[PDB]
Design a protein around this nucleic acid. Structure first.
Lengths: 180, 178
RNA sequence: GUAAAACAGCCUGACCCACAGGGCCCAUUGGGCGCUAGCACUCUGGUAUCACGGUACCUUUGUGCGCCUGUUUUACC
């Protein structure tokens, strides 16, 4: 459909595979030389992006104003190629949709576009012991290595998958103000 | 970098294709026109990147004397036009000191291979058939039929066979398209 | 002959000047220019299609990297 036609373009032009000490993660690039990974990635001073060594110029583990974990890392990479500016495509506040697709790009999960269904705001969650805010939840079995997955609806990036359990999957929301 | 241009080329013009005879890298040259190793011999539909597409033509390529070029040219029913890489095809065959063979298939996902010097080669008895315009590089090679053999600013040809440490690509001449 | 590094750039009377004229391209009376080597985003329009949210190619503009010639500097064949 058009959600699939959006997601495929999205991963083709803005997604990447990234390797850190903890494993393989889909990574999404937002604008200029700036991109987003799970807080859990714990990106080093170098990351293998598409098996290629790239230097990290900066890394913010993202947190709200009262200081609890948002589960996103924003990193600025030292590279000459700039990203397609998708800032028009991510929401101002968390976004509910009846239908979304999660796009995963790892050796494990090559070119994976996965229909999640309804995405609903969720807010607070004690995610493996950590109090984390602004989650979204969709209804699907999630496995390992989809952390980093891109939650999408036509013309809208809704969040980045950061964890799940059994029959529920959770994405950190992706807000406009985090950039610019 | 042959590497940086070849990744560009494979993101914007390459694809993975399934036909009744196997899985092949496919490259699209312009609009809805793309080229395949003649061996696949597309049916009325083919799976392109796992989405089934209708094929409106499939010309098996041959010189004026009628000899086999090992290339099928097919027109796909899709609204998207391919990036016009015709400016990268030489008018006729090109030798190149260092070249890369680029594959996009499930077996060989995102493969980039420095083959080295490529030399004109011409005639070849390809499994019992005489074939013209082969190009030869020295690299060990099956299931890569379809790979895109190229260098920076030059797409030169499509791999169609090999043996041991020798690999041959049907040349890609500018005049073949329109 | 090969490797790092700096200045410059359409041509016409190594640099910086100065004038004058010859040429191409523009989003023009105002400006840009080495590309047989490109890659990336970006901007003006277009063409097509779509669940009207997009997406694909065409073209154009910048900038980053990459590259090519003139000239030259250190350490080496």
């Amino acid at each position: 459909g058009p959600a699939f036609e959006f997601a495929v373009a999205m991963m083709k032009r803005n997604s990447s595979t990234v390797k850190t000490e903890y494993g393989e993660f889909t990574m999404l690039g937002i604008y200029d030389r700036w991109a987003v990974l799970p807080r859990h990635a714990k990106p080093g001073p170098t990351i293998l992006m598409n098996d290629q060594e790239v230097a990290v110029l900066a890394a913010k583990e993202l947190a709200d104003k009262d200081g609890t974990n948002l589960e996103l890392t924003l990193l600025k990479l030292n590279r000459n190629e700039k990203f397609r500016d998708i800032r028009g495509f991510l929401a101002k506040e968390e976004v509910e949709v009846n239908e979304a697709v999660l796009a995963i790009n790892t050796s494990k999960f090559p070119n994976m576009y996965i229909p999640v269904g309804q995405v609903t705001e969720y807010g607070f969650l004690n995610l493996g012991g950590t109090p984390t805010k602004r989650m979204l939840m969709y209804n699907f079995p999630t496995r390992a290595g989809q952390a980093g997955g891109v939650l999408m609806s036509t013309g809208k990036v809704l969040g980045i998958h950061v964890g799940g359990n059994g029959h529920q999957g959770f994405s950190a929301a992706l807000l406009k103000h985090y950039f610019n």
